[PDB]
Amino acid sequence: KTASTGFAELLKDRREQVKMDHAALASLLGETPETVAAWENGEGGELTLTQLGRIAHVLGTSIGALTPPAGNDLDDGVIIQMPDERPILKGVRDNVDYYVYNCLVRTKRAPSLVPLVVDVLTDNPDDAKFNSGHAGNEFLFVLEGEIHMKWGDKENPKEALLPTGASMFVEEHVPHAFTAAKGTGSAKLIAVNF
């Protein structure tokens, strides 16, 4: 259920794994055995980030190992997003819009999944500003218009024109950027990070 119940269970598991009783762990943390027992009873909700770091350190592990997974936001395995629900960020430079990021469905059961419908408002490939590469892989599909894609080394990019209906895979960590094809107005693509 909660961060605190998750932590209570996982803390007890780890403490037992390294064969410490409450007193042994407490002696490493500037607490009483009673307080450690309280954490395992679900009373750790007010522990700070700093405190959690020290707990993980003395237990030879990470805060992540002591906290629950993201959770389950699915309806028997599925989640649906209607179009009007989409979060929207505008990619703006000096009060001029270059991209509109229309956010599609996401889920705590697969946190790396970030699908977007991207409206590409610049058709000047000079405006392409390289990112530093994504943490995960990405699948792209051109919905409207024509895309001018650049990738690799921002000072020596590989480039390609993608017509409507083209699809593309970009591996994790590969820097890239795109605009609409020179003079062609606007384009639209779906980008699925995963």
Torsions phi, psi for 97 (to 5 deg): -80, 135
Are 172 and 105 in contact by the 8 Å Cβ rule? The answer is no
Are 52 and 62 in contact by the 8 Å Cβ rule? The answer is no
CB of 54 vs a copy of itself, minimal distance in Å: 8
x-or-dash string of contact with a copy of itself, 125-164, rule CB under 8 A: ---------xx-x-x-x-x-----x-xx-----x-x-xxx
Binds 63, which of a copy of itself, Zn ion, none (CB < 5 to 8 A, cut-off by type)? a copy of itself
Residue from the set 36, 56, 121, 189 that interacts with a copy of itself by CB under 8 A: 56
* CA atoms of 4 and 1, how far apart (whole Å): 8
Query: Which of 138/146 has CB closer to Zn ion?
Result: 138
Binding to Zn ion (CB under 5 A) within 121-140 occurs at 138
Are 188 and 143 in contact by the 8 Å Cβ rule? The answer is yes
Binding to a copy of itself (CB under 8 A) within 95-124 occurs at 101, 103-111, 113-117
Q: Binding site: which residues? A: 19, 93, 101, 131-134, 138, 176
Burial track 80-116 (b if 16+ CB lie within 10 A, e otherwise): eeeeeeeeeeebeeeeeebbbbbebebeeeeeeebbb
Pairing of strands 158-162, 88-93: unpaired
Binding to Zn ion (CB under 5 A) within 1-60 occurs at none
Binds 182, which of Zn ion, a copy of itself, none (CB < 5 to 8 A, cut-off by type)? none
**Number of residue whose CB is nearest Zn ion:** 138
Give contact residues for Zn ion (rule: CB under 5 A): 138
